[PDB]
Amino acid sequence: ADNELEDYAEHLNKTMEGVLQGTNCAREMGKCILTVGALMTECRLFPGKI
Amino acid sequence: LGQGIRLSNKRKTKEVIIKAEKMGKYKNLMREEYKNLFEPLEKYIQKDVCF
Amino acid sequence: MSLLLTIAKEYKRLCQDAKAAQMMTVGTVSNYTTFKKWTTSRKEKNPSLRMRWAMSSKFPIIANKRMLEEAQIPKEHNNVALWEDTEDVSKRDHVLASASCINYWNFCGPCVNNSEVIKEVYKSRFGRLERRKEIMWKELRFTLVDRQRRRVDTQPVEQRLRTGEIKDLQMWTLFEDEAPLASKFILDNYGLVKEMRSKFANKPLNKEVVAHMLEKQFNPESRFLPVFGAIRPERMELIHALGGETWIQEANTAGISNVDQRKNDIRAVCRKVCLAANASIMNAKSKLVEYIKSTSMRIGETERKLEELILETDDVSPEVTLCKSALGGQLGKTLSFGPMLLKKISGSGVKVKDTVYIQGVRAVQFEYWSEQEEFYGEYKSATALFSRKERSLEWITIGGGINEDRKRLLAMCMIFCRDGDYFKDAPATITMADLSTKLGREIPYQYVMMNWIQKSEDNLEALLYSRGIVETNPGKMGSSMGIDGSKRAIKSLRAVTIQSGKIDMPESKEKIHLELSDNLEAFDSSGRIVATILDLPSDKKVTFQDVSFQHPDLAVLRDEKTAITKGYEALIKRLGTGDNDIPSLIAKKDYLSLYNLPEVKLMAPLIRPNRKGVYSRVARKLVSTQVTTGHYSLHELIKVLPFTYFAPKQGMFEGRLFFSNDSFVEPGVNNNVFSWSKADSSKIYCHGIAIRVPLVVGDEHMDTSLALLEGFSVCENDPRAPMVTRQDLIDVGFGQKVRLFVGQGSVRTFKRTASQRAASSDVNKNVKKIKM
Amino acid sequence: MEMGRRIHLELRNRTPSDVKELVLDNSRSNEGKLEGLTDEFEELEFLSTINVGLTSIANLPKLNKLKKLELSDNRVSGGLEVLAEKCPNLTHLNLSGNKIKDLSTIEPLKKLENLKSLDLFNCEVTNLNDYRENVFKLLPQLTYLDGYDRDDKEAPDS
Fold it and tell me: Which of the residues bear the PTM Phosphothreonine (chain D)?
């Protein structure tokens, strides 16, 4: 950061991320991102194999 | 006591000026070395000077 | 080399086929462009998903094969796949590979001698970073910013050019062997081409990338954006980090890449020439054109002609508009009325005269339009959206921010529409002396009233009073304007709404041709007067820096320096092609003839007679050394030839060659009396006057393909003359024909005799005769 | 221009074995490196390379009959031992305008027993204390320095 504006943006983002990382919906966000990433990289590599 | 201390935010974009007589009102902010140097003398202060 | 043989064998194989032979044989080369499209045609609906799907694969990057073998890049560094022998179906000259390979290449591949050239390729972006480093950020605040939607430019650029001019710049800075026939621009601006050429010559680079980046370098990105505060390219490039609708990040950006001072200087010069050329009633227009053509100004390092700068500029101002009209440049649909701006949104009309009695009974005719007509307006820090109707101001909605500017805008608008009783019955004060013919030219009524209001505030107050005043009804208090431009009052001007927030500027990408009258009244294919000379500052004195008014009337120097400058121009005027001239004599090593040229005989009297002999001996000696060896500096020769008229004598040479006017020239070091630089070898600065040298013969510094282009010219085709290389052009004899490949698919015939007379003069003279 | 074309131009069909003088001033040399020179030049007695963006001396072939050299306006620094093997019969050298910091770079020139005059002007070394004398004590064979002998004896024209 260099100017006051970035510090304000980073403080607000830190507060919101702290609030939002503890919920259960966000647990589902992580579970979807990771599981679908893995399933995407399996269906791409090993089709014809269940 | 000489010219009072000043405050400032992180980026130093804002800078306040206060007299000495009111430093006992913001002691919780000044650094330690400036704090340990002021409390033991608060007794002898009257308005802005030291007896 | 062998590669050449490979290309020839490939061409042979191509011609052996039948279809390829047909398509090559028929038509011209432009078909290539067409063929460039029928191939490699394939798009994708959702690129993101395709890229993510592809990257999972083992080898998602096509790549060259021979370059990998040469660079000793193995298939696997350590149990990691990088590529496998295969051929891409479409290209048929590439092999699949993986992205990991780049990392390996990045960390242990082939290293080039120097990569600092990138700083020149992307000079725009490095300029952006350098400018950003000098911004002192002050403090974020919060408030409802007033933003006006207006067209602006978002890239600071020097020497902004058109697409046509730029295309030659790319060809003449990278691909000279395939350059098209020399254009006017390349000849005029040869210092820029040399400067760009030096950086990107004898370098390993992807030429296309550099050309594209120079295209972006010379393009001022114009955008229609919301804006607040000053308007400067330095801000608009990062406005996103200065303020929005609800916040403001204060910052001082005044002293970075100043681009406004040169626009200001150009407008000042245009004002000066427009005010000069009003003396000649009969032929003001011709004097104006001659005045513009014989003037130039310095931009950074280079010196540019004022005529081209005016064409490139986009200053919608009354000064520039008239000059653009005279040259023939097309310009925007933007009117003016004093120091005010206007833009007709809608409506129409037709002239209708009406009388005005100036004092008692003195009829004076004035023309007024007759139809409804909406108009955006713009005075300093104020704006409006007014409308007129049959010589009446129907309404005006203002959205400015100042009271004084508001009043001035309202007054000039009322005048624009010739509303009010005063137009019917003139004010008592105005007299016939000021009515017209200040210098023998009639001044219509409206401009008389405009001058009246400027003369004194009381007249302005009276004019505003002329518009009816009513009582501010309830609720409308906020949308009301008093006499002092109050936001609200108890009594207010009739039908003068007021609001907060600047009126959004309209937009139209139209170009209208407009002529001008003998009195500099710019008509635009209809009655409208877009601009005139009676909407410019009266006069002011200024000391212009780095400018060249090479015209007699527009000069302040005395007969001495003017005589010396004229003599040097004459000496440089014998540098043209043909026998009995300086270059040919140098080729024939006949230095002796130079001492008896007519221009040296004319210039000899000036030389200081007391020691003319001693100077003559030194300068007569240097030329021989330069002439005989074949290593010479053309500029020094021109500088010291005036002294070679007289008989040598004996004496001590201090170091400087004086004239009869206490002005000297030292042989080798640039000084005010005579200057030049190796960067721009096509200019001679005599007492701050730019004398263009023709490009008929190269010099050790200036030597390149360009320094001869002017000498050559086209002629009737003769197939007997030989076909030579571009480099051999230097060796051809004067007045000798030669065939030459030019550009692409053009074989022409060039004769080394300079025949480029002025085209404008002949056409003008002949056309004037048609009117007798 | 370029040393290649410049040279090919100066050589008006003349073999590179019968010339006694050559000039390459106001040209450019890629990588600040000589390009196009060989041992074919035998009768050469003079050379001049000025303002060519030069920075080093590595591609210099062997020239015996050479007896005068000029490298002004470039940025050469460090390479001064090749002269003892390529041009051992050299007498006059000039380096004004190049990057020279210390004296250790100059020491090799002692082996040029045929050395008579040297020219160092505008170099960083010149900004030292008691430098003319230290150099003279290093290169005794030398007599002229920058056009001036000990005691400030101006040298003749030629």
Answer: 15
